[PDB]
């Protein structure tokens, strides 16, 4: 309901197939979701060494 | 095609209310190659920017 584009859609570029296809660290992303299914904490930061992959 | 005289007179001087500062925006957009600029500084000079914050290092070149 909301109009969302009070910052910037992040779902319906990849679905425009813009940033398609990125190489994973699997271990990496799976430490996001277990942080993600909480019922405490809920939000994980990316800490990292400026030069590698955050975004 | 953009020109800078001096980023120092962007992010060295500038306040946030003023327009860019080194709390504003294009940090997360010069990551895509969307915008165009050419900037000018002095290498000691510009050995603050190193010193700032060490994240336009690898946005510029
Ligand atoms: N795993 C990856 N696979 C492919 N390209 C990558 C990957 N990680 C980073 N990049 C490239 O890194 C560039 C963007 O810099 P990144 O470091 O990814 O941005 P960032 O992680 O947010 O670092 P900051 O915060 O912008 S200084 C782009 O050219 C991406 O294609």
């Given at each position: 309901?909301?109009?969302?584009?009070?910052?910037?859609?992040?779902?319906?570029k990849?679905?425009?197939?813009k940033?398609?296809?990125?190489?994973?660290?699997?271990?990496?992303?799976?430490?996001?979701?277990?942080?993600?299914?909480?019922?405490?904490?809920?939000?994980?930061?990316?800490?990292?060494?400026?030069?590698?992959?955050?975004? | 095609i953009?020109?800078?005289?001096?980023?120092?007179?962007?992010?060295?001087?500038?306040?946030?209310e003023?327009?860019?500062?080194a709390?504003?925006?294009?940090?997360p957009?010069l990551?895509?190659?969307?915008?165009?600029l050419?900037g000018?500084?002095?290498?000691?000079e510009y050995?603050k920017?190193?010193?700032?914050?060490?994240?336009?290092?690898?946005?510029?070149?």
């Amino acid at each position: 309901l909301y109009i969302e584009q009070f910052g910037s859609n992040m779902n319906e570029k990849v679905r425009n197939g813009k940033l398609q296809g990125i190489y994973g660290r699997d271990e990496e992303i799976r430490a996001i979701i277990e942080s993600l299914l909480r019922y405490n904490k809920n939000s994980p930061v990316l800490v990292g060494n400026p030069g590698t992959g955050k975004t | 095609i953009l020109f800078v005289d001096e980023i120092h007179l962007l992010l060295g001087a500038g306040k946030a209310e003023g327009g860019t500062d080194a709390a504003n925006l294009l940090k997360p957009v010069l990551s895509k190659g969307e915008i165009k600029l050419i900037g000018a500084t002095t290498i000691a000079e510009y050995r603050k920017f190193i010193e700032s914050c060490s994240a336009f290092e690898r946005r510029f070149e």
